[PDB]
Amino acid sequence: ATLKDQLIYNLLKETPQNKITVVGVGAVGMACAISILMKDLADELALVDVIEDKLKGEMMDLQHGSLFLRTPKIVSGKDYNVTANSKLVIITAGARQQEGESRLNLVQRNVNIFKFIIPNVVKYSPNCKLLIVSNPVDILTYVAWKISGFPKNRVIGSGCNLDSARFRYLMGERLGVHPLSCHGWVLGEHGDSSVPVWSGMNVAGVSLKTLHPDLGTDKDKEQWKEVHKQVVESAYEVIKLKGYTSWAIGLSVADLAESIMKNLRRVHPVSTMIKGLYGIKDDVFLSVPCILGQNGISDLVKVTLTSEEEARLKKSADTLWGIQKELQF
Amino acid sequence: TLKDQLIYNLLKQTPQNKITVVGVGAVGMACAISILMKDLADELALVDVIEDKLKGEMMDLQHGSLFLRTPKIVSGKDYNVTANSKLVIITAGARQQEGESRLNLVQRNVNIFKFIIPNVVKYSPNCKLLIVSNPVDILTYVAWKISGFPKNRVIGSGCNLDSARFRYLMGERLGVHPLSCHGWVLGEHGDSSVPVWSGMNVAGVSLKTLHPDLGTDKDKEQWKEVHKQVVESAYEVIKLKGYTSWAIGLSVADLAESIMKNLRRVHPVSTMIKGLYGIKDDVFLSVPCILGQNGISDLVKVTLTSEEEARLKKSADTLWGIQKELQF
Amino acid sequence: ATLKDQLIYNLLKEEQTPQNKITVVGVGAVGMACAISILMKDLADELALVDVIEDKLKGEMMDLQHGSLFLRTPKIVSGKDYNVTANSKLVIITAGARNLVQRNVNIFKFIIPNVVKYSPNCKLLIVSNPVDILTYVAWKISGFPKNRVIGSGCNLDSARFRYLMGERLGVHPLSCHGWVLGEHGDSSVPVWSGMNVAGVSLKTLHPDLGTDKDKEQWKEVHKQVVESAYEVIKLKGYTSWAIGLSVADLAESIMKNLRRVHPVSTMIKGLYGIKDDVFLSVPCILGQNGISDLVKVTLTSEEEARLKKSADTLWGIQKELQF
Amino acid sequence: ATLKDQLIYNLLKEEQTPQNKITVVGVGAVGMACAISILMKDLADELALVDVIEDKLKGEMMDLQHGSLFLRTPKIVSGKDYNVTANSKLVIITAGANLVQRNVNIFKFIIPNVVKYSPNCKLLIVSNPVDILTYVAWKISGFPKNRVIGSGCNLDSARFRYLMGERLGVHPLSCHGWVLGEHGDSSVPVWSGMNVAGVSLKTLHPDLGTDKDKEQWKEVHKQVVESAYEVIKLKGYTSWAIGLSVADLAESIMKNLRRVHPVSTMIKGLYGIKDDVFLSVPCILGQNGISDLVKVTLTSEEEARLKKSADTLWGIQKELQF
Ligand SMILES: NC(=O)c1ccc[n+]([C@@H]2O[C@H](COP(=O)([O-])OP(=O)(O)OC[C@H]3O[C@@H](n4cnc5c(N)ncnc54)[C@H](O)[C@@H]3O)[C@@H](O)[C@H]2O)c1
Ligand SMILES: NC(=O)c1ccc[n+]([C@@H]2O[C@H](COP(=O)([O-])OP(=O)(O)OC[C@H]3O[C@@H](n4cnc5c(N)ncnc54)[C@H](O)[C@@H]3O)[C@@H](O)[C@H]2O)c1
Ligand SMILES: NC(=O)c1ccc[n+]([C@@H]2O[C@H](COP(=O)([O-])OP(=O)(O)OC[C@H]3O[C@@H](n4cnc5c(N)ncnc54)[C@H](O)[C@@H]3O)[C@@H](O)[C@H]2O)c1
Ligand SMILES: NC(=O)c1ccc[n+]([C@@H]2O[C@H](COP(=O)([O-])OP(=O)(O)OC[C@H]3O[C@@H](n4cnc5c(N)ncnc54)[C@H](O)[C@@H]3O)[C@@H](O)[C@H]2O)c1
Ligand SMILES: O=C1N[C@](c2ccsc2)(c2cccc(Oc3ccc(F)cc3)n2)CC(O)=C1Sc1ccccc1Cl
Ligand SMILES: O=C1N[C@](c2ccsc2)(c2cccc(Oc3ccc(F)cc3)n2)CC(O)=C1Sc1ccccc1Cl
Ligand SMILES: O=C1N[C@](c2ccsc2)(c2cccc(Oc3ccc(F)cc3)n2)CC(O)=C1Sc1ccccc1Cl
């Protein structure tokens, strides 16, 4: 008999219980993978990409670290059979933006990628929650929702989670306080058009807007509006300096994955179907504070916005619908 | 100011558990993320020669602060940023191209070390040095010679990764988690590494006793192939993704953990093995070491078979050959 | 209107089934140490507590709930009725007052049918003493396959042994390997042949290891394991922290399907000349289906005889039990 | 030669100073809950335990030591002699016997013994009445106010957030609310700062925390007080919730996180308080203890409860001999 048979007596012959799939093993996908592995959120990790060499190499590199991890099974493949029975599927797959090329071009190029991915994911994990990271995240969340046929609670966009995370870091740096104790919400459209909700900004329940009524206005001597401007600046700066962003997004995604996998019911700024709110009548996804758990977005926090903040959200929803109506599905 | 209206200042201290990472490439950054997610430091310093990459990497880590428990992340080309580090991790250096040997990088990484090591020692004279840059065994010796530090404070990542990979492969063959599969890969980190077949066990049950052909050419199960798979492992990963990062990042954080927490765990790491196995030269290679707050305080004297001791001295002879032809 | 309705807009109605639920039966010193350790290791999305003393039970549940801000287990429940334990992945039995096998078999006769009724697919983790007999009792009453009925067995004995080994060598217990097998407690067997640091056999280096002609008296380390148990009980009246931690470690392998090897009590019929339905500790592979595999340890004639003697004793008691 | 010498080659002799040492004084239900929580959060490289009951102390130490295989704290020590506490970064006082003079007398022995072995430590006071006993520890130690911290309203605040969470169907982490002033019966819920995702509950419901409230949110604070008495009535004491809240404070101190916590501090100069009185306000907590304070703007009613508490505490404090 084999050494295995000489050493081990088998009792049982024969599904993963807390499986997570990462689609796209680029810099974002891999940072999501390592963060999830170090937070023990899954009993099985699946990786999918179209570049087979890179995919196998990334899987092997992770597997070689098994001794230091508590995720006993790490798999990869171009075939979505490796994703079967995932509780959560994270989409970080995307086309590399060409020089000159417009952003509407990239939208459709990523829609074409999504037209192949989403049916393959839903076929192997029909009851999964979809977590969209790929840009433009608000449009691609809508695309994922339309293709999948899933109820809106199971289609989550990373949205303004990173924007809010960056805002809190910058707030923290200005005040000499840990970002955990600095509260502030960046809502609406992820990226350039995001809305800092000045009314909600506080340390220990002390409203910064109450203490300083000029907060977030051009009338502000301290120019706190620059803290939101810097959120936008930092994204461009990181890309200019290292060519991409990975660690910050990976960490923010693992945080969302934690609330879903552990059914924590924490409130996060994530992209959801906001039709019926703030005068929005189109099928658009934008970030609002959402209760996140085992069934995805179960609830949403109704944030009271100023006329300016509400108009900004409306304008973003009109822009997103404009792109969404002209997409080829 | 709004800061003064909101916060009243009471006090107008040195970092207590500071770690520096030198070299922010794929290895350095994987070491950084692994250390950050294991809460090993109250302060993380990053050093590199590439300005842009350094600032970008620091900023990317800082933007994830909300999800971390390391309140201070700093970077700079000037080593004043590294002052009073408990542990300095060196990952700076030229890496293998597809198929290239680690010994081929020695000359240019030794020059890189001639600049780094004096700068690190100047700002952290009492730190422990953790060397990752390849060839790791020779570069650990180089760091030891340049620094003038006692041998206990100069640690090379060594065969820690080789042993982790071996245990993973053992685990996959037996259907057991690597944590429960015990086996030691010693000597040089690389082509001349030694799998110690005598110490391979699950729950104290010797695999060599149960299968006397273990690690021999007479083996029908070809267990010797598990070690070949360990030797080839970096070459295969380099061929597929162009470098290795995750596995080494994880193994370094494991060593950082034993040092920062003074655990006194036994790890296969690069060390001054003069006086052991008939070695009379200042050779650095992997043996099981007790790792704590003062680095390597103790060494485990592994009993090697005639053939296993042979293979280890072959590894030591190779490394000394390269080591001896070096001007400081 | 409610402030909840003014603040929160509901999207989903029906709240689903718990995915990673753990139940602790008996909220004594052992049960509560098991509970806090599992909570601080984030092994469960829901924790259920059961006891017969209703006031203590509610107080313990409330004390844990008040620490929620510092935890990642969003639901903590308790009750005398086993409906609170429904759909548990793992049920830990620490129930009964801390000779006493007959009163403990009788409470198991009430507890086990109640646990299996609400969680038919759970793994059973038995801690209550005599753990080896009570694991057999749980197996018989539940009707579960042997893989889903685990006794804490020699896990604590082995942990204590490794601690003492570590202290003697100046090495962390994690790097000190040694297995204490068979019957939990006084009759446990230290397997001297498997004792090592970095794969270096202590018995090979010192052939007198675990013998009376040993000048270093390493046999005393096992003697100290037994002595320490009595000492802790003499000094504080019970043991809680060490058993709590060891149980959370078992819970981790099970919940995370790690397939790590642990010294736990299992049905060892067919091994070491044992022909009866007896549960004794051997190294077991632990995962989502409980004990899927067992490590066949090579024992000396003396070590094998000690297990056979323990098996004859345990079967003697077991034979006379009525279910 | 010994098996240890045959197996291990020693490189270093000198084995010195613990880098991240924590001491727990009083191994009762509170002390032991603090100990296990700190051990499971890997906050220390060394744990020291002190008590007057020698048998219980050794038994508790041994029970923790037997769990070493599952921990990352390589050294657990105990003793009646404070030599075991030398060079602690943090010293947690949970020792205890109206009741104030009995505890003051216990503190007159403890605090000098702690300060001589760990002159640079931060003192974390849990023993009740925590606000008076934090003042007592500060007076006896002679330490600057930044290094003398009372657990204060940390537990009150945590309980409040738990109850808020249960009412809203939201995790306590996402439910924000501050309970300040005097720990216990006289604690002040700051209704203005209560929010979920920056949405002020008082703005949405102006009747929040008043008797005019049809939803009776004032009852959530009443329930915080009710729950403390209930837990004591049901199990005889509280341990897990306090051990966890202390471990959270220990984390921000040991890791220099600079997180904001409701803890007891010397509040002379604030809210018209002119006496040396300790009570809870949101404090920035790090490696030097309380480095900063958040100046919370309070209503007339909230400020009145806090000043009233300060007058009462000073009344007791002036009538104490030490
Ligand atoms: N939401 C956020 O805050 C945030 C932040 C940073 C980046 N991003 C986005 O995440 C995406 C990925 O970023 P990146 O840096 O990792 O890009 P990347 O180019 O490095 O990686 C993308 C990966 O997607 C893969 N891919 C392409 N087509 C695929 C397909 N049909 N199936 C599976 N995989 C496929 C590629 O092969 C590649 O490996 C981008 O769209 C980016 O804009 C979002
Ligand atoms: N098991 C192991 O020990 C192990 C495993 C994998 C890789 N490695 C080694 O780690 C090293 C780094 O690998 P990599 O993939 O990160 O290479 P990399 O090219 O991605 O990064 C190397 C970094 O070193 C920096 N650097 C060069 N000179 C420097 C200087 N004088 N000061 C500071 N920084 C300087 C570079 O600028 C670069 O950022 C290599 O030597 C590699 O072989 C070791
Ligand atoms: N296997 C080991 O290594 C190990 C180590 C230590 C203790 N133990 C055992 O664990 C058990 C418990 O220890 P303890 O110190 O917590 O005892 P304990 O007396 O403090 O607590 C026992 C609890 O069981 C409860 N109980 C009694 N009947 C019950 C019933 N029908 N249903 C539910 N609960 C019931 C009691 O009310 C009590 O709360 C003992 O049998 C003890 O010997 C085992
Ligand atoms: N939110 C809070 O601040 C909070 C919550 C709960 C309890 N507490 C307080 O914590 C304290 C302890 O609670 P407990 O349940 O553990 O009490 P306990 O009676 O169980 O334990 C107290 C311990 O203090 C020890 N002790 C007495 N004198 C001592 C001395 N001179 N030196 C060292 N140790 C000594 C006792 O021996 C005993 O072990 C009480 O004052 C209690 O009110 C505070
Ligand atoms: O950090 C980030 N790096 C990004 C990136 C990552 C790899 S290439 C580009 C990045 C950065 C700057 C503009 C930018 O513009 C876009 C927007 C959509 C699109 F399809 C392509 C580029 N994208 C993607 C992204 O969304 C973020 S977050 C961010 C972006 C802008 C403002 C504020 C925030 Cl918080
Ligand atoms: O640490 C412990 N405290 C105990 C206890 C718990 C509450 S009151 C008594 C304790 C101690 C001594 C004998 C004792 O009696 C028994 C009874 C039945 C039985 F199967 C084993 C021991 N029980 C329970 C227990 O099993 C342990 S572990 C242990 C016990 C004896 C020797 C070695 C070890 Cl490792
Ligand atoms: O949970 C708790 N259990 C307590 C206890 C602990 C062991 S015996 C009594 C507890 C509870 C109720 C009143 C009570 O009264 C006292 C008695 C003596 C004294 F010096 C201070 C307070 N003590 C101590 C304590 O401070 C808390 S927290 C708390 C207490 C009251 C209201 C609100 C909160 Cl958050």
Side-chain angles (χ1 to χ4, degrees), chain A residues 121-175:
Chain A
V121 155
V122 307
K123 173 186 161 171
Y124 286 100
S125 307
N127 299 109
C128 79
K129 272 78 57 184
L130 284 168
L131 180 52
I132 312 310
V133 189
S134 311
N135 272 319
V137 71
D138 298 304
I139 297 160
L140 301 185
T141 305
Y142 163 81
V143 168
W145 173 66
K146 279 281 174 157
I147 302 167
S148 65
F150 279 6
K152 55 186 184 174
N153 60 281
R154 288 202 279 129
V155 189
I156 311 112
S158 73
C160 288
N161 201 44
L162 183 57
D163 310 52
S164 293
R166 280 177 168 146
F167 191 80
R168 290 173 75 174
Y169 164 74
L170 295 163
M171 206 190 314
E173 170 173 301
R174 292 266 290 242
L175 302 169

Side-chain angles (χ1 to χ4, degrees), chain A residues 28 96-97 101 103 106-107 110 133-137 140 159-164 166-167 186 189-194 228-240 243-246 248-249, chain B residues 60 63:
Chain A
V28 171
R96 301 218 114 276
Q97 179 155 358
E101 174 220 275
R103 286 180 200 186
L106 193 71
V107 179
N110 287 339
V133 189
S134 311
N135 272 319
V137 71
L140 301 185
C160 288
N161 201 44
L162 183 57
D163 310 52
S164 293
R166 280 177 168 146
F167 191 80
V186 177
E189 198 190 337
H190 166 67
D192 306 328
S193 299
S194 68
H228 176 70
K229 283 250 182 200
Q230 273 180 101
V231 169
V232 179
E233 305 290 73
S234 69
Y236 286 95
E237 205 176 3
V238 177
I239 267 82
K240 186 217 292 177
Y244 58 92
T245 75
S246 55
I249 186 60
Chain B
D60 202 357
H63 296 165

Side-chain angles (χ1 to χ4, degrees), chain D residues 2 13 24 29 60-61 73 82 108 121 151 158 162 164 166-167 181-182 187 198 209-210 268 276 280 291 297 305 309:
Chain D
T2 60
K13 285 199 167 178
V24 179
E60 289 299 357
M61 175 200 67
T73 305
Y82 282 74
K108 279 187 251 189
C121 80
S151 71
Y162 163 74
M164 204 188 145
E166 172 176 41
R167 278 214 177 188
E182 197 188 342
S187 68
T210 72
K268 185 169 89 177
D276 288 344
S280 288
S291 64
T297 169
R305 298 178 71 174
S309 278

Side-chain angles (χ1 to χ4, degrees), chain A residues 3 125 238 269 278 280:
Chain A
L3 176 54
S125 307
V238 177
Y278 313 110
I280 296 131

Side-chain angles (χ1 to χ4, degrees), chain B residues 59-113:
Chain B
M59 283 177 67
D60 202 357
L61 290 185
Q62 287 172 331
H63 296 165
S65 294
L66 181 58
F67 317 106
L68 297 164
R69 288 125 325 259
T70 303
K72 198 182 187 187
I73 301 169
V74 296
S75 77
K77 66 174 172 205
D78 189 326
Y79 281 76
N80 60 350
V81 289
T82 80
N84 311 111
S85 289
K86 288 284 176 180
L87 177 71
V88 185
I89 302 158
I90 314 295
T91 71
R95 75 199 181 192
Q96 285 162 300
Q97 290 279 332
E98 199 209 311
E100 181 183 13
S101 168
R102 288 154 186 103
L103 311 166
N104 200 30
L105 314 154
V106 78
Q107 280 270 281
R108 75 208 105 122
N109 288 169
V110 163
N111 288 320
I112 285 163
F113 271 47

